[PDB]
């Protein structure tokens, strides 16, 4: 939802990270994209391709994920 507004200057986020081996410097360094915790930057472009086909909210992605789970079942 933040990437949609300023995409050129807001970093994508693949998923958060909970690695209990992390030290506090690593918790501090991996906090990107305006997150309250560590994160990994989506170098997959899924942000761009979802934003180009609609999908301008997190609820849109939630509905899509639930529907794809239904499709997997």
């Amino acid at each position: 939802e933040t990437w949609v507004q300023d995409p050129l200057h807001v970093r994508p986020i693949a998923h958060a990270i909970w690695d209990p081996h992390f030290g506090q410097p690593a918790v501090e360094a991996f906090t990107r994209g305006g997150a309250l915790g560590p994160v990994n930057i989506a170098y997959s472009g899924v942000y761009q391709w979802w934003y180009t086909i609609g999908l301008r909210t997190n609820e849109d992605l939630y509905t899509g994920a639930l529907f794809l789970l239904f499709l997997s079942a």
């Binding site: 995409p7 050129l8 200057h9 807001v10 970093r11 990270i17 909970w18 690695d19 209990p20 992390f22 030290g23 506090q24 690593a26 918790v27 501090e28 360094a29 906090t31 990107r32 994209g33 305006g34 997150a35 309250l36 915790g37 560590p38």
Partner: protein
Amino acid sequence: KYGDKSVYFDLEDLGNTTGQWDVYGSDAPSPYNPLQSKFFETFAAPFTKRGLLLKFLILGGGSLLTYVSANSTGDVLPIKRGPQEPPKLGPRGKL
């Protein structure tokens, strides 16, 4: 006969031939005290069914692991403490 002069193929006693030996397996009786032995027997007979032991081990260990990692705060693991630091703006603005 296995004990003859350089005979090691007693076909009847195939254990001595193939090397089936308790090399250190002393058959000496229980050196423990009887009372503490009975104590351990009665207090560890719950762990006699290997299948129930395995189910208990896996489920209780996973439960304790989730409990530790969910109730532990950031003082014992920095990943739950969080950033406690402002985020650096990446290259080229942030992209």
